Design a protein around this ligand. Structure first.
Ligand SMILES: *O[P@@](*)(=O*)O(*)[C][C][C]1O[C]([C])[C]([O])[C]([O])[C]1[O]
Ligand SMILES: *O[P@@](*)(=O*)O(*)[C][C][C]1O[C]([C])[C]([O])[C]([O])[C]1[O]
Ligand SMILES: *O[P@@](*)(=O*)O(*)[C][C][C]1O[C]([C])[C]([O])[C]([O])[C]1[O]
Ligand SMILES: *O[P@@](*)(=O*)O(*)[C][C][C]1O[C]([C])[C]([O])[C]([O])[C]1[O]
Ligand SMILES: [Ca+2]
Ligand SMILES: [Ca+2]
Ligand SMILES: [Ca+2]
Ligand SMILES: [Ca+2]
Ligand SMILES: [Ca+2]
Ligand SMILES: [Ca+2]
Ligand SMILES: [Ca+2]
Ligand SMILES: [Ca+2]
Ligand code: NA
Ligand code: NA
Ligand code: NA
Ligand code: NA
Lengths: 114, 114, 114, 114
DNA sequence: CGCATTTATCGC
DNA sequence: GCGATAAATGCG
DNA sequence: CGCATTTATCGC
DNA sequence: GCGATAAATGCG
DNA sequence: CGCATTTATCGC
DNA sequence: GCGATAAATGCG
DNA sequence: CGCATTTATCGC
DNA sequence: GCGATAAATGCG
């Protein structure tokens, strides 16, 4: 199924964060309404932050995360969690290799902010 | 109920990350087996990373997250999510004020690494 | 923090389901906009369904779940999960005793329907 | 990625529940260690329970859920959630059609029991 | 015509 | 913890 | 004034 | 897999 | 050799 | 809320 | 006595 | 994508 696509409230400030756990060079791309809004690129095998950002839903709220590595797009896993019906997490994993750990690029979206 | 306490596999490398969304000065404390293992302190209202870290479960796996602010401990919300039965997230929110947004200190644990 | 309270889209059909895992007699109560909409009562220690139902968000969407047992309200744990940004789960646990398993009354809300 | 596969503690009692939200006739199949352990079959478009069951992890814990409809296997979405580090949910959605609601067969595993 | 007027939410 | 902000009728 | 008119979503 | 449904101007 | 002996967890 | 249950040395 | 010996997992 | 790693009997 379609992974890494989330609908958050229209025109809402949120935070994006990505980590790396692979020898491959992660090209994390964050779209908003099918528009590129941010691009993190880095390499790590020790869960290093390759990018943080504050963005805006726009006035759809269609945030999507794509993860390419060296050109080859990765396969994605995603979910959204809400605590106390206020604090939201949007979680994205990704696999570039074959050992199925899906941590090569870990993306964490969260909102509300402030 | 008890929040911010997680049991991850014995002796396993994981990553801890904290953000701030409050005028209050977040004192994030990360215990392992009731031992302090890491202490992040910072202030932000723009979801800034106040700390990243690679730690070890030890040989219980009892990771706990506590969040004090200016002395006053915050109330916590927590959950653990697993994708494709391999990639784990342990999420912690916290409230220091009264507006119940619970984003003042957002803590994100993830594993496996590498 | 406040548990067992969820905001789902205005005027939306969803399903409620409750289970029992305690010698105590679970009085599961499902409010909508602070109005009682359904009341399941039963007893089991073998995860028996004590009630299923199709309800409507109304035109707020404030669905709340309360769990009393023999009069004494239980302490609640809750979260909401979304898969493929379409299929929603709202999960509620509850504790009437002291052994902290929180399965005495397990409540599962899901939507969309059809 | 691989969906509908969960690893729960060895030799542990849990509950399986399935719902239906499609004109298609859902053949929910629940394997344990790649052994069929339970088979629910039913039809509904009003979120009807097509099966409940108490099973055992066995001594691997590899519980898998497969969903065929009229022969054609469905595409799956899955996740596991844990509250207060005690109460576990394993959630499975599935799509037999093309409208991508993924509620046609909703499967809910939960543990511990008692 | 467009543009000010009239307590829950967002932003530093 | 604070203050600035924003479907109908009236008006420039 | 209220009430029909004009492709994405919900319901059996 | 199918069909019925629903911010502005026009009208009864 | 196999089989009883010696406080956290599971089952009705 | 209750009680029955289960890595080493000793033994039948 | 302790210490090497004998394909799924973790670490850079 | 790679290689180093780790319940019983044997032995120093
Ligand atoms: O696909 P191949 O060139 O390899 C890379 C594997 C990659 O890095 C290693 C360290 C591991 O973490 C794996 O999960 C990644 O996919
Ligand atoms: O409790 P009081 O001194 O205030 C602080 C509120 C705090 O900061 C603001 C910006 C808001 O984000 C709120 O959520 C925090 O609790
Ligand atoms: O609080 P006390 O009268 O007891 C009841 C415990 C109750 O039932 C048992 C079976 C157990 O499952 C526990 O979790 C429940 O709280
Ligand atoms: O695939 P086609 O024969 O159709 C069936 C659609 C099916 O039922 C309807 C009611 C809807 O709920 C859809 O989600 C299901 O896939
Ligand atoms: Ca990988
Ligand atoms: Ca990896
Ligand atoms: Ca706050
Ligand atoms: Ca805040
Ligand atoms: Ca209990
Ligand atoms: Ca119980
Ligand atoms: Ca469908
Ligand atoms: Ca359906
Ligand atoms: Na006033
Ligand atoms: Na037409
Ligand atoms: Na004794
Ligand atoms: Na060999």
């Amino acid at each position: 199924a379609t992974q890494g696509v989330f609908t958050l409230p229209a025109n809402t400030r949120f935070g994006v964060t990505a980590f790396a756990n692979s020898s491959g060079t992660q090209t994390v791309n964050v779209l908003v309404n099918n528009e590129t809004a941010a691009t993190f690129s880095g390499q790590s095998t020790n869960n290093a932050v390759i990018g943080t950002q504050v963005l805006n839903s726009g006035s759809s709220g269609k945030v999507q995360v794509q993860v390419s590595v060296n050109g080859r797009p990765s396969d994605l896993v995603s979910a959204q969690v809400i605590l106390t019906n206020e604090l939201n997490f949007a979680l994205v994993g990704s696999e570039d290799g074959t050992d199925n750990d899906y941590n090569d690029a870990v993306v964490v979206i969260n909102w509300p902010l402030g």
